[PDB]
Design a binder for this molecule. Sequence first.
Ligand SMILES: [Br-]
Ligand SMILES: [Cu+2]
Length: 208
Amino acid sequence: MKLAPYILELLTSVNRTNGTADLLVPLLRELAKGRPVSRTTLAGILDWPAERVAAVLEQATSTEYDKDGNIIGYGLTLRETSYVFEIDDRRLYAWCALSTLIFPALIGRTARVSSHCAATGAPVSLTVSPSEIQAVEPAGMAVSLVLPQEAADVRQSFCCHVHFFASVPTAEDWASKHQGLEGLAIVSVHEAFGLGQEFNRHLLQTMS
Ligand SMILES: [Br-]
Ligand SMILES: [Cu+2]
């Protein structure tokens, strides 16, 4: 299907201010180590003042902090979700199915992804590298997409509707009872991975 609207709105939804893309990739790489990330650590990596880091994060209202005020969640998170995202010996989580397909390229590591079908509860899993997916189980795994909203919190307007499913027919059956959602579509996990590659390619072309 035509994916340009999804790419555009996701980029827009993500791109709220300058420096967001330049902040996003190092933050993801830090979170991937499996521990909370301090703003000062980010500042050192970026060679930014801490106030600049704070300003960018302030506009990302979905951002999760722990009791120490350190960053524990931004697309990738230490707080449990339905989407398990493992790198090496560290179990992380992701906010949505598409997230798990996009992050490995941005952090430059292969991830073991697992979840459950949103319609049947069946376990689903796959291996996601920066360049390809492997070990897709079950092989016909599907993903639901909706059109991201620009101003809304990306987590509640997009992520909460973007799931894995055991198969395309199972997902389309589920989708028939989810009317009203703007841009709701069912794609194979392969088409969703391609969507993520296009997203990443555009996102990375905007970094400093
Ligand atoms: Br289009
Ligand atoms: Cu998401």
